[PDB]
Design a protein around this ligand. Structure first.
Ligand code: HEM
Ligand code: HEM
Ligand SMILES: CN(C)c1ccc(CCNCc2ccc3ccc(N)nc3c2)cc1
Ligand SMILES: CN(C)c1ccc(CCNCc2ccc3ccc(N)nc3c2)cc1
Ligand SMILES: C[C@H](O)[C@H](O)[C@H]1CNc2nc(N)[nH]c(=O)c2N1
Ligand SMILES: C[C@H](O)[C@H](O)[C@H]1CNc2nc(N)[nH]c(=O)c2N1
Ligand SMILES: [Zn+2]
Lengths: 404, 406
């Protein structure tokens, strides 16, 4: 009926009743579970039902359901859809919707923070140059000299028969990846394609491992435009290690602000194709995935060798040892620079508290176990031992096709 | 594209389609509305038995390339006739062997499946007493332990029968350390084993008071109270744990047993149910070093080891837990190697599982796999399986969980 959900460390049991509010299919069926897949495989009455549902969520949130304002607002939406095939959100509704989308994101371990989100309304944007201005302001605000503040900037919604506003870059801060003819890649291999798009739109490339990319910003049915971010806007942290003096000589660094810019924001059936958002990093994102993934910077062996570890055999656990010191260096360096960051133990502990808040508030919480459990030391964190139910609620952040 | 799940490896960029999943006749816990993949346990008529039986016989004859043959059709008739007159049927020896291997091959939670074709199947379907089960189990342990050069094996006891009680081994594993509840509410020994420990005592076992007291076996023959059997200590190979450079680690007095021999799972083949069919392989080091030793609800030694390592246990950001865990895993690997007892680290194991996935893609068009269980509990993304999408589904023959007999 409703899923019984158990924590195996504590022996405690909840029932998820929130999942009954899901109106959107995931990829699983009784025959086979597809939960480990990264991406999904692929009229007015439909929009109207999503709109009413959202306005209802909204007025319930301010505890004014059935108010005159509530009924009038539903009529406004009804009237606008019926006449125009679409409608528009009020700023306060947009603010609520943006927070709910974050709250509903099953892959986010940082949702304890969901109610604290600065929302910049950029729906009065008419050009790539204007998008750039809004993005620079977003970055300045969120960066805040290292005392990071979560924020989202929302550009004009999609409209029928008109191209979307898009930011082509997957994040506002990305390091170039330059594909050598010698097969290899210099920089971040995750960004080979975006790096190449930039160059062919007139960017003069560098030749470094950590060259900050320009943004490709696209206003509707126009070719994207190139904008270089003012270097003083992009806060970066040089990596060093608290005891291993040689670590700094590796010339490693990372940027402060994780600002994701290729996701679609869906609120009440309306779609916001450019709505970049940022919070702060969990250390494993950088220390484990970005720096140690074999298809990213892949620095494990280098660090292992500097640590004089036995690289010849798996059973020396040289990979594990190097990874741990790498994560420590990331934590140490961010802490030294006074840049906000959270370790994977602290983050998962807060998420457990979040699950409990959400159980009392909504009778459940959608969560993606494979993404909530950190990429090192999994079972050493409480979320490993916690069963989770994954489902899609709306407002939602969604993936969308690359615009090229 | 193909109308089957597309499966991607994000490390290598490679793509496969799973067509094997089409062979699942048993639903799992998920629906289009919500994924329940992270759940540990989610929740005969002759007609029903017969189709499971026909399916298995079909699988058997395919595996020997005689599908459609005279011997194939005769075996079908024979099974149909046997169910027709008795309500059940019986497996030929070679069918049992094939089925036991296929159940292992089909287990989505097992990372060790590269080994699936190497399984010694001991037929114990003649067993008629609890004493005899014990003899069979001791023989299994001796064969499988092989003085440290471990060999995978399963011993199969008589199947469930109409109007007759089950053969059951009450213990979850052939080797289990006692868990003694203390007055302060804490547990001495392995907290995982509190219930079986107390059952052993209720059934007459004189309890020790150590952290590593090996439990006796509670063995149950049909329609009888279970009987208590003490394993001769020389049959139970254990490994004292030391660390290659941290000299104090040996002084901790930790140890683990060599043989992971699981004994409470039901082996289902062709509709037949083998309620007692203990099987054993060898350990992956993380099972001992990470879960059994560092789970908060297991031995929970993380903080103790971190203090010995002089780490800052007052703050999460020192990564004291991660550091201690790595050294404990290393100690397990070092100690087993020193003792010449078969063991596999989580890198070697996952690498071989990636090879297994490729073998099965070509052999069967897919491989059912539970990502949450396949990815090791430390260093997740440092292993190749983390970056491999997987499809999970139930195939038969199968190992299944079954209710505790009490
Ligand atoms: C405030 C500190 C935050 C922390 C520590 C945090 C943590 C994380 C982590 C570790 C992930 C996994 C990402 C990956 O492995 O690629 C993630 C994903 C995600 N986060 Fe959060 N987050 C924070 C703030 C936010 C904010 C402000 C938003 C949006 C308003 C957000 C929305 C999301 C979404 C939609 C995902 C899934 C994205 C995907 O599927 O790629 N998070 N978060
Ligand atoms: C040969 C070396 C083997 C290795 C290294 C290995 C490794 C593993 C590991 C690490 C697990 C996860 C267990 C847990 O976390 O509790 C597992 C599960 C499992 N293994 Fe294997 N295994 C091996 C042999 C076998 C054999 C011989 C069988 C049966 C004939 C088998 C059947 C299973 C089954 C059914 C599970 C699921 C356990 C459950 O759901 O409780 N394995 N294996
Ligand atoms: C298709 N590919 C290559 C691909 C798809 C999804 C991903 C996941 C990206 N997730 C990035 C992301 C998103 C939101 C975040 C919020 C906070 C935070 N600290 N990190 C965050 C990180 C990566 C690669
Ligand atoms: C309901 N409870 C308490 C519970 C449920 C499932 C489990 C999973 C136990 N799986 C153990 C297991 C099974 C088969 C194995 C085969 C080989 C190997 N090395 N380890 C192996 C380990 C444990 C407890
Ligand atoms: C195949 C697998 O689903 C994929 O590698 C996932 C696993 N869990 C993850 N978890 C997080 N936080 N981020 C990720 O990118 C991934 N990748
Ligand atoms: C809640 C979660 O399903 C549970 O802790 C699982 C996760 N993955 C696992 N993976 C393995 N190999 N063994 C386990 O016991 C578990 N436990
Ligand atoms: Zn699922």
């Amino acid at each position: 009926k409703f899923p019984r959900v158990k924590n195996w460390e504590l022996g405690s049991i909840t029932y998820d009743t929130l999942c009954a509010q899901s109106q959107q299919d995931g990829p699983c069926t009784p025959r086979r579970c597809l939960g480990s897949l990264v991406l999904p495989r692929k009229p007015a009455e439909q929009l109207l039902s999503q709109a009413r549902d959202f306005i209802n969520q909204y007025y319930s949130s301010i505890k004014r359901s059935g108010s005159q304002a509530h009924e009038e607002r539903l009529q406004e939406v009804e009237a606008e859809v019926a006449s125009t095939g679409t409608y528009h959100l009020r700023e306060s509704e947009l603010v609520f919707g943006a927070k709910q989308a974050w709250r509903n994101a099953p892959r986010c371990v940082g949702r304890i923070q969901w109610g604290k989100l600065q929302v910049f309304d950029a729906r009065d944007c008419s050009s790539a140059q204007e998008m750039f201005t809004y993005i620079c302001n977003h970055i300045k605000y969120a960066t805040n000299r290292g005392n990071l503040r979560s924020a989202i900037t929302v550009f004009p919604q999609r409209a029928p028969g008109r191209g979307d506003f898009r930011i082509w870059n997957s994040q506002l801060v990305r390091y170039a990846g330059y594909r050598q003819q010698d097969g290899s890649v210099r920089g971040d291999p995750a960004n080979v394609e975006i790096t190449e798009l930039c160059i062919q739109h007139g960017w003069t490339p560098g030749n470094g491992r950590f060259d900050v990319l320009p943004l490709l910003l696209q206003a509707p049915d126009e070719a994207p435009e190139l904008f270089v971010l003012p270097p003083e806007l992009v806060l970066e942290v040089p990596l060093e290690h608290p005891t291993l003096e040689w670590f700094a000589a590796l010339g490693l660094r990372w940027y402060a602000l994780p600002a994701v810019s290729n996701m679609l924001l869906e609120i009440g059936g309306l779609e916001f194709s450019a709505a970049p958002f940022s919070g702060w990093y969990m250390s494993t994102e950088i220390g484990t995935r970005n720096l140690c993934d074999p298809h990213r910077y892949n620095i494990l062996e280098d660090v292992a060798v500097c640590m004089d570890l036995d690289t010849r055999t798996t059973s020396s656990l040289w990979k594990d040892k190097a990874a741990v010191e790498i994560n420590l260096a990331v934590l140490h360096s961010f802490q030294l620079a006074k840049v906000t960051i959270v370790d994977h133990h602290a983050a998962t502990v807060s998420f457990m508290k979040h699950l409990d808040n959400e159980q009392k508030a909504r009778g459940g919480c959608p969560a993606d176990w494979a993404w909530i459990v950190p990429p090192i030391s999994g079972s050493l964190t409480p979320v490993f031992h916690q069963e989770m139910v994954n489902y899609i609620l709306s407002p939602a952040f969604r993936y969308q096709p690359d615009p090229w």
